[PDB]
């Protein structure tokens, strides 16, 4: 049910400089991210659970035939169970007894917000307890003069991770629980590596609150932008919007699509989930209930760990 | 109706220190009717200003009760600061009038019967008008001169909008706008010619909605920004009049009335066609009224959303003028290249491009005939409502901060990605589209090589026409670039930045008569490039040897003639091309190449000059608690010692700021008028907490009310109640009370600090790239950052000691030819300094110039002196960074900044004994080696703990390293406890101030290669 | 000084004899603009009884229920089975904060033990019928706030914003 | 399937070593050595995955297809790779050490922290389910040695005390047990303290002031002045080498790998560094 | 069946004698494996109520305390005082969850008289005092943990987990 992604190195989750709240001195092409998208994560059990006649055109298609429903992406240090938390332009990584007095802050007035996320991303954020972002600067070297290559540098700028962390997602099917079990697989971006492992875990479900976390990006049907954006905090608490690219599809080797999100680590309201669901076609109706089978609209409620989708 | 409100301006003379009660309305109106008021006018002069309050409502209006014929002046933040004015007024009583009459040289040669054009044209060249007979700015109230005159004329006239909003039945608004995220729009940029125009878009296209306003609504209408000293408001006024069609020696009485003051240098608005430097904020606010024009006359309408849909879609009339107008250049020029490119996109994508690249956040509050009125006038405490509908708008802007909605996700991308419907030029995408490399996040339109076969190979894939139109696509694209739709206008809009005046002018003009000037002009604009500004010494030489090193050089276009008409936004340039040396080059070809660079230092070694140094160095700044103080939080005044968090619970806080605000406000009195305020405030948990604990007070206050007896009563049980409950709220919540002539009172000084600082950049060779006024960021060269830094905070806190423009820099004001405008001297400026090779990639020094801003103002913290023992701050901070090499300077040394008038040649005097150390190490007086024998001597001094041990561990230490042996440094000893707390984040800053001072010359010497 | 008293809305009629009270004061907690509700309680940790409804206090952070306060005591038949307590005016998260407080307010509760003899599981329920609180403001909202009928010409308004805000937790038992 | 086999083999540094990283000025040393995610030595993937391929095709252009097909193919970028190394991780660093009632005298000792052994039980713990080569030997020394996290320990029963980089006075107790060491000489082991460590190995890097001097006139050159940072000699990496499972990659393991003794590994070569002997573990402890 | 009950830490002595049925059985809801302190409940809406310590029932989300789960009834002088109460394991959520819960078990909380006397002046408090954790780990950390000192070692790190883990919100009076 629950498998643990065990990093064996820093890892490269290549974001397009979407966030950046940051200094080393760094001016790094390449910033990465903290949570991983979960098209990383499904295309990554895939790249396991491949065969020759799964092949077709459309990847998403043939993803939820190699697979069941994927939840959403936390951090488990022995210890902890870390939850991401956007403020806007801002991360962090915090448990969950941060989260329960959390909705009572929200409503509340002027400064007693200031009092609150200011020592919350600030000084109990465990962002900086846990993640050493880590420059590193390859190039190219021609083998016939050997020395650098003209015009071929880059600065891609990993995640490493100075106590050992594993990240944390949830799987519904048990054929599978074995054969994942104990896998060495090419986890991430520039050729890093992680271990998942697959232990049975007891997970509450499906809690109807208001103010919800989302642990994945809350995917945006993409139509109904202005009929969205005009009231955003009727779904949004807070956090960011941003279009992010949903990635990039194997068979195909071209980027995958782009939608506006809901990104991870907001905090949403409840009236999110009658807004997609009834801002559907039939599409789209069949189009995104694959996007939660890899798990993108996982909703969290800051009571307890309850996770359910947006079309659960 | 409105539009008359210049006798709701004017409800005073503006002599008015020389009318109240003694030292001989002495004049009232020559071109109108009398004041409107039946309590209109009168009530918007009683909910205008503090001291309405202070000392008690009727006190205000009765003008005599502690009265003083003995005049001074105050500063508004800190009243400290005495000022004089004297024997000396605006002249004699039979030409008292003649400057009433210098009102009618254009006001009454034009007809008044329209009230659009007179309310817009008065408003700018009042004060400038009356400086020039010189009347030092007197204080609105004699008792209490803490306020300056048009600071609450101008108050009286903005809430005016309140007062004539609520005469249909009952309407009333305020409406703030707020930009969703500007530096990391800024950010995106890779030549500066990006970085320049998106400061500009932030400020022209929030310059677009704001005529729409004032065409319609007249000035005075928008508190911030002040649109007293806006340079964009002396450019749009300056078209208002040339569209009208007068002589251009009548302007003259309008134009070198502006000129000498506003816009300093020849560069003018009307030298190089536009306002040099975007200068609105990404945050305004409006005071409106609740009225809709139809012509001559007002309705209104009830519902709320009249503005929030409406303003908006201004917004985006904007963006659909500025890039339909973009769409007429590259047709009109569309044969000369690189706009055949431009063009030919602008045909392909007008579904992505309709959507504005930036969003704005426009936050709206009302006010009704409740809270205000109560049978028909003022109510008990009228005045707690306006700071707390200011507190209901930042509120907002304090909610919906937390979700920044960024401005690519508004586009619709789906079906373009999921199908295959992007429009490309170029190369075809192998993986279904391509990164947009100057946002980073879009996708391309323009595929372009970086090589392989460049210039051939580029036309057979539909870029080319012929050959010599690609120089001008290799002008501004460099190859191997891609672009976003949003870049390639912005790119497009770099190369012609005199296009924005159908922005800029609001449309004043039709859309083709704006376009149609500079459709015909062919004036080229240079931005300077890093390598420019890393060269300017450089160029300084080359001056001053001007030919006799240049004989080899006479073939390189460095000593050819300067050939077009070539000038640019940036003053030492714009008055020092024209020397016999060409500044248009782009010198990464002549001494930053590496073939005929090394030649070229072949020619300096044997003329003995400096060789060029490669790292400019970028500035910028940041106002420290700014809208908490326009909140009226005592943050500023205690930064670091008391944060803003910290007003959930007052009462346990309650030491040092109760003894703050008290000896503020017995401060800011005179007279008779300063013991009535100190036994009635002091009463509040020392007393039994009701009335009769401030009785006594009468005895002395007997002592004027039977004077000229125009009194309506024998008791006084009400106004030592109704000042007992202003103290009531000024004391129990610590807030200070937001008026309309405290947000016109800073922000006409934040529109002063704005022009000045940039005056004291150019008195160095300095750049501006944006300048938004409370905020900045500019682009020094490498000398000249320290006594800058220096001079910008003694300017923006208020200090002087050199002659500006024409302006006089005083303690805590600032003096144009007579009139001490105030200043900002409590309120801290922080700067992150950044040196920089001139080839990085400079998308992430704008990055890393706000990220490392935005962690130094939450972590940064040191121990400062505290009426004698060591309290903490936290903000107020220089910090530097060579590469990785991060200093981190306070400037403050004392909480508050300033308490006496021998306290302000100490602001930023920790960096002077920078510059004294740097003053002896370049004459060879005090060695090179001090530096790096520091290391041995910080072990010591960070673990010794009386300063007097400490003594002779610094003075060794420069003794040791000294060439001379009598060359005496004087360090101050009061340095040497400081020591700082960076906690839980991973980089390196030392925990001492004098590991900071050393390693801030590190850095500079470090800079000048 | 002043003081409070809470009254919450079930999906049962259990608020006919709560308290004796309908202004108490002159100014409310509470208000009623036009907009919908205003100054509206939310109290974790407490769920629903509810047949002869009471709330009992549950060891859950999620429990919630959500309620209103008005001037005033109830009944005169209470101080053995309820609470009551005077917090510093911000200890209550409520929802739509308009009104300025009043650094101090004193409030009580409808309290009932814990019954330390059942296996309570809880079950949180929406608020549906949009008769019933249609007529619950006949029963107190316009009881407390004579307001109804009077200036709110949105009847709906305020019934969907019932509809959509209000949903609590039931003992279920 | 994925990552079918791996196998482990540790880098000494038979030679110096530079290996540089972002080449800023963060610890008053202009080139500094590549470090971790704790501040410890590393070599980055990339590092070893280029400096092995780059010295296999200009010894055995013969195998280029193969090399190009196992480690990386950069004509034709399409294809995946079936080789790819881990970050080596730091297993020992020579220190010079004093002894204190030693029966046997030494004058250098291999150093390491715990938190350095906890990365190699972290690759050792992943790499096991391979089923090719396991040696649990190895990984069940690594156990012992972690069950005793918090003290010092020395692998040679005969120390009990010394002086380590001449500096740092530490107090030893071995193993109660014999404990065979991992290293292939026969120095002790002195697995220390995660406290003291980070300055005994901080110690034994090699900080060097390097100048440019202008040829004519024998004086240094303006600005020519720099610091960097070497790795020792002796000092032992350990990194193992993944492998997917097609038969160009076995054909890889069969005798490229197995005639692969010494390879130069990193920059600044012409100053003779960077010259490493590779020892696998398949034919030691 | 199966009852438990709640044991409130603060650094306030109030500690000293409340408890006689300290194991009772064998199981107690928390536990401590060589990393720390497991299942310790935090409760809302409950501060300490600094004279003679126990638990005042407040109205704020805000005010948390944190605790530990031990088999038993404390004393049986009470139950007019405590809140005892029976829960599924469900509604109160500790950290540190090891095994799946017996799906029904009883509580016994130290529970305060509401008794506004004057507002309740919220503190909050993390643990510091190094002396107070070495006197109240032979005060309780053994009296219920017997294991203690048997089968766990690392008492630093007991130490080291509630300084920064363990806190509670105040009275201030
Ligand atoms: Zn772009």
Redesign the interface.
């Known amino acids: 049910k629950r498998v643990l992604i ?1 990093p ?3 890892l490269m989750f290549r974001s397009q400089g979407e966030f950046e709240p940051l200094i080393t ?1 760094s001016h790094t092409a390449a910033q990465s991210l903290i949570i991983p998208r979960p098209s990383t994560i499904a295309g990554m059990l895939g ?2 659970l491949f065969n020759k006649s799964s092949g077709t055109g459309d990847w998403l298609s043939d993803l939820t035939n190699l697979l069941a429903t994927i939840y959403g992406t936390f951090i488990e240090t022995n210890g902890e169970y870390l939850f991401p938390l956007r403020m806007g332009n801002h991360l962090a990584l915090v448990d969950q007894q941060h989260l329960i007095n959390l909705p009572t802050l929200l409503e509340k007035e002027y400064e007693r917000r200031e009092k609150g996320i200011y020592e919350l991303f600030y000084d109990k954020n465990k962002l900086f307890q846990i993640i ?1 972002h ?5 190039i190219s ?1 021609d ?1 016939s003069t050997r020395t650098v290559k003209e015009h071929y540098l880059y ?1 891609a700028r990993y995640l ?3 106590k ?1 962390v594993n990240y944390v997602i949830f799987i519904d099917n048990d054929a599978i629980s074995d054969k994942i079990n ?5 986890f991430g971006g520039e ?3 992680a ?1 998942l492992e697959v232990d049975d875990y007891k997970v509450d479900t499906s809690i109807e609150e208001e103010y919800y976390l989302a642990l994945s990006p809350i995917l945006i049907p993409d139509e109904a932008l202005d009929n969205f954006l005009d009231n955003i905090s009727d779904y949004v608490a807070m956090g960011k919007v941003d279009k992010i690219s949903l990635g990039f599809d194997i068979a195909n ?1 071209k980027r995958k699509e782009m939608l506006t999100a809901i990104l991870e680590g907001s905090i949403v309201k409840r009236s999110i989930i009658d807004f997609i669901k009834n801002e559907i076609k039939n599409d789209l109706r069949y189009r995104f209930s694959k996007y939660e089978k890899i798990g993108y609209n996982t909703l969290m409620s800051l009571c307890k760990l309850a996770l359910r989708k947006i079309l659960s | 109706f409105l539009d008359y409100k210049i006798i709701a301006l004017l409800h005073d003379p503006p002599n008015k220190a020389w009318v109240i009660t003694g030292r001989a309305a002495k004049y009232i109106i020559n071109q109108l009717f009398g004041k409107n008021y039946s309590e209109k006018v009168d009530n918007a002069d009683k909910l205008a200003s503090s001291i309405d309050r202070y000392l008690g409502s009727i006190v205000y209006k009765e003008r005599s009760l502690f009265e003083n014929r003995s005049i001074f002046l105050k500063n508004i933040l800190l009243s400290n600061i005495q000022r004089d004015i004297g024997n000396l007024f605006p002249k004699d009583k039979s030409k008292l009038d003649n400057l009433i009459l210098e009102y009618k040289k254009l006001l009454n040669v034009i007809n008044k019967t329209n009230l659009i054009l007179k309310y817009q044209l008065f408003y700018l060249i009042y004060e400038l008008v009356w400086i020039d007979s010189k009347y030092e700015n007197t204080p609105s109230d004699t008792r209490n001169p803490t306020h300056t005159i048009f600071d609450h004329l101008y108050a009286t006239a903005a809430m005016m909008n309140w007062i004539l909003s609520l005469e249909k039945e009952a309407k009333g608004y305020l409406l703030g706008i707020d930009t969703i995220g500007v530096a990391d729009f800024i950010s995106k940029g890779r030549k500066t010619r990006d970085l320049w125009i998106s400061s500009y878009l932030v400020s022209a296209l929030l310059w677009y909605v704001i005529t729409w306003f004032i065409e319609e609504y007249g000035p005075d209408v928008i508190l911030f920004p002040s649109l007293r000293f806006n340079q964009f408001y002396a450019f749009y006024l300056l078209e208002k009049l040339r569209k009208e069609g007068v002589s251009e020696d009548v302007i003259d009485e309008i134009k070198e009335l502006i000129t000498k003051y506003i816009f300093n240098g020849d560069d003018l608005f009307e030298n190089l066609k536009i306002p040099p430097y975007p200068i609105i904020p990404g945050r305004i606010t409006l005071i409106l009224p609740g009225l809709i024009r139809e012509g001559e006359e007002y309705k209104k309408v009830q519902d709320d959303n009249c503005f929030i849909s409406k303003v908006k879609e201004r917004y985006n009339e904007g963006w659909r003028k500025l890039i339909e107008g973009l769409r007429c250049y590259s047709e009109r020029k569309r044969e000369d290249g690189f706009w055949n490119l431009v063009c030919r996109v602008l045909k392909l994508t007008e579904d992505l491009l309709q959507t504005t690249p930036l969003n704005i956040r426009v936050k709206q509050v009302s006010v009704t005939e409740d809270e205000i009125f109560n049978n028909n006038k003022l109510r008990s405490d009228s005045w707690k409502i306006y700071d707390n509908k200011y507190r209901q708008l930042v509120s907002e802007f304090k909610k919906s901060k937390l979700v920044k909605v960024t401005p690519e996700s508004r586009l619709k991308l789906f079906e373009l990605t999921k199908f295959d419907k992007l429009p490309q030029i170029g190369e075809k995408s192998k993986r279904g589209y391509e990164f947009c490399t100057s946002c980073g996040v879009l996708p391309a339109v323009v595929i372009m090589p970086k090589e392989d076969e460049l210039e051939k190979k580029l036309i057979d894939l539909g870029i080319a026409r012929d050959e010599k139109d690609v120089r001008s696509i290799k002008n501004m694209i460099s190859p191997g670039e891609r672009l976003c739709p949003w870049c390639l206008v912005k790119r497009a809009l770099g190369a012609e930045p005199r296009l924005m005046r159908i922005l800029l002018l609001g449309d004043l003009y039709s859309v083709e008569k704006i376009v149609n000037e500079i459709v015909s002009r062919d004036v080229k604009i240079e931005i300077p490039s890093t390598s420019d500004i890393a060269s300017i010494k450089t160029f300084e030489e080359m001056i001053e040897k001007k030919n006799e090193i240049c004989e080899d050089l006479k073939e390189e276009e460095v000593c050819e003639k300067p050939s077009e008409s070539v000038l640019s936004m940036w003053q030492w340039f714009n008055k020092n091309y024209y020397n016999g040396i060409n500044l248009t080059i782009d010198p990464e070809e002549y001494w930053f190449s590496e073939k005929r660079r090394r030649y070229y230092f072949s020619v300096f070694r044997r003329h003995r000059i400096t060789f060029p140094s490669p790292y400019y160095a970028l500035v910028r700044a940041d106002s420290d608690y700014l809208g908490d103080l326009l909140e009226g939080k005592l943050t500023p005044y205690l930064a670091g010692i008391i944060d803003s968090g910290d007003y959930a619970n007052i009462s346990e806080k309650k030491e040092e700021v109760n003894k703050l605000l008290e000896e503020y406000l017995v401060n800011a009195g005179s007279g008779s008028i300063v013991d009535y305020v100190k036994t009635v405030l002091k009463c509040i948990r020392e007393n039994l907490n009701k009335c009769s604990c401030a009785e006594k007070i009468y005895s002395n206050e007997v002592a004027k009310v039977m004077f000229r007896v125009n009194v309506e009563k024998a008791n006084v049980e009400e106004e030592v109640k109704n000042s007992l409950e202003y103290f009531e709220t000024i004391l129990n919540e610590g807030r200070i009370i937001v008026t309309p002539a405290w947000h016109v009172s800073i922000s006409s000084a934040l529109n002063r600090g704005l022009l000045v600082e940039l005056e004291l950049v150019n008195k160095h060779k300095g750049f501006v790239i944006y300048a938004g006024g409370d905020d900045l960021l500019a682009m020094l060269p490498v000398d000249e950052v320290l006594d800058f830094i220096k001079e910008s905070r003694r300017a923006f806190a208020g200090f002087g000691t050199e002659k500006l423009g024409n302006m006089c820099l005083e303690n805590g004001f600032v003096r144009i030819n007579n009139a001490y405008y105030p200043s900002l001297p409590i309120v801290g400026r922080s700067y992150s300094v950044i040196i920089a090779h001139y080839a990085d990639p400079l998308f992430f020094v704008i990055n890393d110039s706000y990220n490392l801003l935005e962690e130094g103002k939450e972590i940064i913290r040191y121990r400062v002196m505290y009426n004698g023992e060591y309290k903490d701050a936290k903000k107020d901070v220089a910090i530097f960074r ?4 991060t200093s981190v300077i306070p400037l403050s040394l004392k909480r508050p900044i300033v308490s006496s008038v021998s306290d302000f040649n100490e602001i930023a005097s920790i960096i002077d004994v920078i510059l004294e150390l740097k003053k002896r190490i370049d004459e060879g007086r005090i060695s090179v080696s001090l530096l790096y024998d520091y290391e041995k001597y910080k072990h010591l001094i960070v673990a010794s703990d009386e300063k007097y041990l400490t003594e002779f561990l610094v003075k060794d230490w420069i003794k040791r390293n000294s060439l001379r042996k009598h060359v005496e440094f004087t360090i101050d000893e009061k340095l040497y406890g400081v020591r700082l707390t960076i906690e839980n984040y991973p980089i ?1 800053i030392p925990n001492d101030l004098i590991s900071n001072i050393v390693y801030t010359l590190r850095i500079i010497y470090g800079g000048e ?1 | 000084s002043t003081q409070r008293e809470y009254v919450f809305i079930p999906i049962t009629n259990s608020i006919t004899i709560d308290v004796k009270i309908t202004i108490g004061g002159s100014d409310h907690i509470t208000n009623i603009d036009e907009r919908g509700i205003h100054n509206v309680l939310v109290i974790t940790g407490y769920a629903v009884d509810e047949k002869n409804g009471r709330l009992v206090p549950t060891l859950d952070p999620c429990d919630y229920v959500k309620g209103i306060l008005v001037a005033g005591t109830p009944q005169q038949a209470q101080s053995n089975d309820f609470l009551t307590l005077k917090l510093p005016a911000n200890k209550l998260y409520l929802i739509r904060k308009k009104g300025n407080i009043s650094d101090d307010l004193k409030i009580y509760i409808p309290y009932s033990s814990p019954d330390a003899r059942n296996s309570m599981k809880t079950k949180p329920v929406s608020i549906s019928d949009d008769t019933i609180v249609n007529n619950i403001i006949k029963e107190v909202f316009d009881k407390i706030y004579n307001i109804t009928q009077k200036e709110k010409v949105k009847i709906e308004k305020v019934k969907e914003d019932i509809k959509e805000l209000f949903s609590y937790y039931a003992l279920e038992q | ?3 079918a086999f ?1 196998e482990p083999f540790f880098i000494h540094a038979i030679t110096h070593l530079h290996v540089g ?2 080449s ?3 610890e008053e040393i202009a080139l500094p050595f590549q ?1 971790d ?2 501040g410890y030595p590393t070599i ?3 590092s070893l995955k ?1 400096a092995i391929k ?1 010295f296999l ?2 010894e055995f252009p013969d195998k280029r297809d193969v090399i190009y097909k196992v480690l990386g193919e950069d004509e034709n970028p ?1 294809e995946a ?1 079936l080789g ?1 190394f ?2 080596a991780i730091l297993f020992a660093i020579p220190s010079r050490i004093i002894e204190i009632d030693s029966a046997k005298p030494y004058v250098w000792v291999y150093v390491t922290t715990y938190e350095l052994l ?1 990365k190699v039980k ?2 050792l713990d ?2 096991s ?2 089923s090719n080569a396991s040696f649990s030997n190895l990984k069940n020394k690594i156990d012992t040695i972690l069950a005793k996290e918090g003290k010092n320990i020395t692998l040679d029963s005969d120390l009990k005390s010394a002086i380590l980089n001449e500096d740092f006075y530490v107090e030893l107790e071995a193993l109660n047990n014999k404990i065979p060491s991992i290293i292939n000489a026969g120095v002790p082991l002195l697995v220390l303290e995660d406290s003291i460590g980070r300055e005994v190995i901080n110690r034994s890097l090699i900080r060097v002031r390097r100048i440019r001097i202008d040829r004519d006139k024998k004086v240094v050159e303006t ?1 020519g002045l720099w610091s960097e940072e070497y790795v020792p000699m002796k000092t032992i990496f350990f990194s193992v080498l ?1 492998g997917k499972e097609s038969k160009e990659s076995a054909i890889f393991a069969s005798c490229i790998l197995r005639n692969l003794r010494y390879v130069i590994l990193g920059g600044k070569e012409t100053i003779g560094k960077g010259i490493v002997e590779l020892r696998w573990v398949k034919d030691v402890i």
């Open positions: 065990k064996l190195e820093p001195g790249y396991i050493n880590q420059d590193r600067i390859g070297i083998k600065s490493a991770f100075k050992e104990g896998k060495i697989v090419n050729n890093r590596i271990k080797t | 060579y590469q990785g090499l390196k290669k | 399937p994925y990552y791996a990283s972002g800023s000025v963060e470090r995610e704790l980055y993937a990339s280029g780059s095709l200009k399409e790779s790819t881990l970050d906890k972290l690759y992943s790499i389910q391979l600005g993944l």
